[PDB]
């Protein structure tokens, strides 16, 4: 059986730069009678099926923009993207079809861009939720770069650790930023016993946190 | 047009078998191989096996030899994958793919994938909650609204805004599992002058429960 290795596991480039990524096979993929290497490259964007880019190591699939090139032979192969676009955000896999099929581990491509501060929004529990007996407060930290960010929650001025779940988006092709949601869930009875809820965002773009608050009797 | 139509999400109990279809249309079915590929959440593609539908001949990744059985019904242009004695290790998305063996030796058209979850848990549909800001208007050139989709199982759920006609400014967050239920959220950002005047609705689908919910976002008082 054939074993496939890709490197690096990820890499970051700025829009318009060139990137090359590498694939190795445990056995040659060069065919005897043929002059072809049975090696294909695939692009998989978040939430989508893989898409064929190149086959026979170097033939481009129809519709594939000409910025994607494949090269190499035997046990050593390369995929090159000239002038990366933010729409190229994806995992890239090589795959042998010399005997059966084997995918490489993938190379994740990330985009580098200018730092941007988060836009921070806080939201109280809905009255729908409250009739359920539970109560989520949600904070969106949107359209920021780089990815590293800290969020802190306070109730009536006091920090809070349990019941806070966080989730980051994939890097956006539209503007190369990240976003983050933070949800604090409490029981309805604990939520009503307290009056003020605050979410604080610490990002490298500014030395002081961005702070959003709401009060249960604000109107 | 070439299409490979896979079944929707499958919640199955540990120890049982699951059999999933891949219905091919738009080309000569017996001229291409059907390959099957596994992908765990956030992980890489892993090839399972293939069937040559003309002959019925099958080849498997040895790791899957005891797990998978590939078949093909030539009369219905449908390839099937059966997974036996399922465990949590089998929880994944399975793709089928048209595989041009003998020519490109590449997988040129792919199914959308069938999400298999192996669990004893029951199917629970989501509750969908509107996210509208409290009285204090905050930074009021654009306004951010959202939907909280709480308490469902299994994955996946999808979210759109105004049936997909509200596209830009959207952020849909990955689901997190907590105490046996998933939660996710989605935000949308619009000009403050357009809302509440022009409606904003999130449209939530949960295919495992065959449920769809629309939640219009309306201002609080
Ligand atoms: O990672 C490249 C993809 O970026 C966009 O999608 C991500 O960014 C969105 C906005 O924050 C999120 O809602 C989404 O969940 C992320 O996957 C873009 O929409 C995709 O088309 C890109 O392939
Ligand atoms: O040879 C590399 C490893 O291959 C297998 O991994 C497959 O499945 C992983 C997660 O299930 C993917 O992330 C990976 O890309 C695939 O190769 C498996 O991990 C082992 O058999 C091998 O060490
Ligand atoms: O019917 C429109 C097209 O549907 C398929 O393509 C879509 O769905 C595939 C599976 O999710 C994707 O890989 C593809 O990128 C989508 O556009 C079909 O394969 C096409 O031939 C149809 O034109």
State the Cα–Cα distance between residues A192 and A198, nearest whole angstrom.
Answer: 15
Torsion sign, CA atoms A99, A103, A105, A108: positive
Are the Cβ atoms of B171 and A142 closer than 8 angstroms? yes
CATH class, domain B122-221, is: mainly beta
Pairing of strands A150-155, A134-144: unpaired
Pairing of strands B176-178, B127-131: unpaired
Are the Cβ atoms of B176 and A102 closer than 8 angstroms? no
State the Cα–Cα distance between residues B160 and A49, nearest whole angstrom.
Answer: 19
Residue A189: which H helix or E strand, with range? Answer: helix A188-193
Q: Half-sphere exposure of A125 toward its Cβ, with a 13 Å CA cutoff?
A: 26
Put simply, the chain B residues between 49 and 78 with a CB less than 8 A from any chain A CB are 50, 59, 61-62
Whether residue A170 has its Cβ less than 6 Å from ligand 1 = yes
Protein residue with least CA distance to atom 9, ligand 2: B44
| Residue B85: Cβ within 10 Å count | 11
Torsion sign, CA atoms A157, A161, A165, A169: positive
- Residue B143: name the closest of B65, B218, B63, B49 by CA: B218
Closest residue in B to A63 (Cα) is B108
Q: Half-sphere exposure of A205 toward its Cβ, with a 13 Å CA cutoff?
A: 17
Pairing of strands A107-112, A10-14: parallel
Residue A10: which H helix or E strand, with range? Answer: strand A10-14
DSSP string across B13-79: -TT--EEEEEEEESS-GGGSEEEEEEE-TTS--EEEEEEETTTTEEEE-GGGTTTEEEEEETTTTEE
| Residues paired with residue A43 on neighbouring β-strands, in sequence order | A51, A92
Burial of A102 (0-12, 13-18, 19+ CB in 10 A): buried
Question: Cα dist. B113→B43, B92, B169, B178, B206 in Å?
Answer: 15, 9, 27, 25, 16
Please, are residues A141 and A155 in contact by the beta-carbon 8 Å criterion? no
Put simply, the chain B residues between 73 and 132 with a CB less than 8 A from any chain A CB are 95, 97, 99, 101, 104-108, 110-113, 127, 129-132
Please, are residues B202 and B162 in contact by the beta-carbon 8 Å criterion? no
| Contacting residues for B220 by C-beta, under 8 A, at least 6 apart | A124, A127, B132, B133, B134, B135
Write down all domains in chain A, each with its CATH number in brackets: 1-113 (2.60.40.10), 114-216 (2.60.40.10)
**B99: distance to nearest CA of chain A, Å?**
10
Are the Cβ atoms of A124 and B221 closer than 8 angstroms? no
State the Cα–Cα distance between residues B170 and B163, nearest whole angstrom.
Answer: 13
State the Cα–Cα distance between residues B175 and A42, nearest whole angstrom.
Answer: 26
Q: Half-sphere exposure of A33 toward its Cβ, with a 13 Å CA cutoff?
A: 2
CA-derived radius of gyration, chain B = 21
- Residue A88: name the closest of A180, A176, A179 by CA: A176
State the Cα–Cα distance between residues A101 and A40, nearest whole angstrom.
Answer: 10
State the Cα–Cα distance between residues A28 and A80, nearest whole angstrom.
Answer: 21
Helix (H, G, I), strand (E, B) or coil at B209: helix
Interior/surface letters B62-83, b for 16+ CB within 10 angstroms, e for the rest: eebeebbbbebeeeebbbbbeb
Q: Half-sphere exposure of B15 toward its Cβ, with a 13 Å CA cutoff?
A: 1
Does the beta carbon of A74 lie under 8 angstroms from any beta carbon of chain B? no
State the Cα–Cα distance between residues A203 and A146, nearest whole angstrom.
Answer: 8
Please, are residues B191 and B142 in contact by the beta-carbon 8 Å criterion? yes
CA-derived radius of gyration, chain A = 24
State the Cα–Cα distance between residues B34 and B22, nearest whole angstrom.
Answer: 9
| Contacting residues for B102 by C-beta, under 8 A, at least 6 apart | none
Q: What is the largest CA-CA distance in chain B?
A: 69
Helix (H, G, I), strand (E, B) or coil at A132: coil
State the Cα–Cα distance between residues B203 and B172, nearest whole angstrom.
Answer: 12
| Residues paired with residue A79 on neighbouring β-strands, in sequence order | A21, A70
State the Cα–Cα distance between residues B51 and B45, nearest whole angstrom.
Answer: 18
CA angle A96/A98/A99 to nearest 5° reads: 105
Question: Where are the extended beta strands (E) located within A145-217?
Answer: 150-155, 158-159, 164-168, 178-187, 196-202, 210-215
Q: Half-sphere exposure of B95 toward its Cβ, with a 13 Å CA cutoff?
A: 25
State the Cα–Cα distance between residues A195 and B57, nearest whole angstrom.
Answer: 68
Please, are residues B113 and B94 in contact by the beta-carbon 8 Å criterion? yes
- Residue A46: name the closest of B155, B54, B172 by CA: B172
Whether residue A43 has its Cβ less than 6 Å from ligand 1 = no
Whether residue B110 has its Cβ less than 6 Å from ligand 3 = yes
| Phi, psi values for residue A213, rounded to 5° | -135, 155
Are the Cβ atoms of B106 and A97 closer than 8 angstroms? yes
Domain boundaries, chain B: 2-121, 122-221
State the Cα–Cα distance between residues B218 and B220, nearest whole angstrom.
Answer: 7
Question: Cα dist. B17→A134, B20, B60, B156 in Å?
Answer: 37, 10, 18, 21
Are the Cβ atoms of A50 and B95 closer than 8 angstroms? yes
State the Cα–Cα distance between residues A177 and B140, nearest whole angstrom.
Answer: 22
- Residue B36: name the closest of B107, B90, B102 by CA: B107
Question: Cα dist. B67→A102, B20, B21 in Å?
Answer: 18, 14, 16
| Contacting residues for B202 by C-beta, under 8 A, at least 6 apart | B128, B130, B146, B147, B159, B160, B161, B186, B188, B214, B215, B217
- Residue A31: name the closest of A62, A55, A67 by CA: A55
Ramachandran quadrant class, A106 (left: phi over 0; alpha: psi -120 to 50; beta: rest): left
Question: Cα dist. B13→A204, B124, B211 in Å?
Answer: 46, 15, 21
| Contacting residues for A113 by C-beta, under 8 A, at least 6 apart | A14, A15, A145, A175, A176, A177
CA angle A45/A49/A55 to nearest 5° reads: 90
Resolution for this PDB entry, in angstroms:
1.7
- Residue A57: name the closest of A67, A76, A72, A42 by CA: A72
| Phi, psi values for residue A130, rounded to 5° | -60, -35
């Amino acid at each position: 059986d054939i074993v496939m290795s890709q490197s690096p596991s990820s890499l970051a480039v700025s829009a318009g730069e060139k990137v090359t990524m590498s694939c190795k096979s445990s056995q040659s993929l060069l065919n005897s009678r043929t002059r072809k290497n049975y090696l294909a490259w695939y692009q998989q964007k978040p939430g989508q099926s893989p898409k064929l880019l190149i086959y026979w190591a170097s033939t481009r699939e129809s519709g594939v923009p000409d910025r994607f090139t494949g090269s190499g032979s035997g046990t050593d192969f390369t995929l090159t993207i000239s002038s990366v676009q933010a729409e190229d955000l994806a995992v890239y896999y090589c795959k042998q079809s010399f005997y059966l099929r084997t995918f490489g581990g993938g190379t994740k491509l990330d985009i580098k861009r200018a730092d941007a501060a988060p836009t921070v929004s806080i939201f109280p529990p809905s009255s729908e939720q409250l009739t359920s007996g539970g109560a989520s407060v949600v904070c969106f930290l949107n359209n920021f770069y780089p990815k590293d960010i800290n969020v802190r929650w306070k109730i009536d001025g006091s920090e809070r650790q349990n019941g806070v779940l966080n989730s980051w988006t994939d890097q956006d092709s539209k503007d190369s930023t990240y976003s983050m949601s933070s949800t604090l869930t409490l029981t309805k009875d604990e939520y009503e016993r307290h009056n003020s809820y605050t979410c604080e965002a610490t990002h490298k773009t500014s030395t002081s946190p961005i702070v959003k608050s709401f009060n249960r009797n604000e109107c | 047009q070439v299409q490979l139509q896979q079944s929707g999400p499958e919640l199955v109990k540990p120890g049982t078998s699951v059999k999933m279809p891949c219905k091919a249309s738009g080309y000569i079915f017996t001229d291409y191989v059907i390959s099957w590929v596994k992908q765990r959440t956030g992980q890489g593609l892993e090839w399972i096996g293939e069937i040559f539908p003309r002959s019925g001949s099958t080849y498997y990744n040895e790791k899957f030899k005891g797990k998978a059985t590939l078949t093909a019904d030539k009369s219905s242009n449908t390839a099937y994958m059966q997974l036996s004695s399922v465990t949590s290790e089998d929880s994944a998305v399975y793709f089928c793919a048209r595989d041009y063996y003998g020519t490109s030796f590449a997988m040129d058209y792919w199914g959308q994938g069938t999400s298999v979850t192996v669990s004893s848990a029951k199917t629970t549909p989501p509750s969908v909650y509107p996210l509208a800001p409290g009285s204090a208007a905050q930074t009021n050139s654009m306004v951010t609204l959202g939907c909280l989709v709480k308490g469902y199982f299994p994955e996946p759920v999808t979210v759109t805004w105004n049936s997909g006609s509200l596209s830009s400014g959207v952020h849909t967050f990955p689901a997190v599992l907590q105490s046996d239920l998933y939660t996710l959220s989605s935000s949308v950002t619009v000009p403050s002058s357009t809302w509440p005047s022009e409606t904003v609705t999130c449209n939530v689908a949960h295919p495992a429960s065959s449920t769809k919910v629309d939640k219009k976002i309306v201002p609080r008082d």
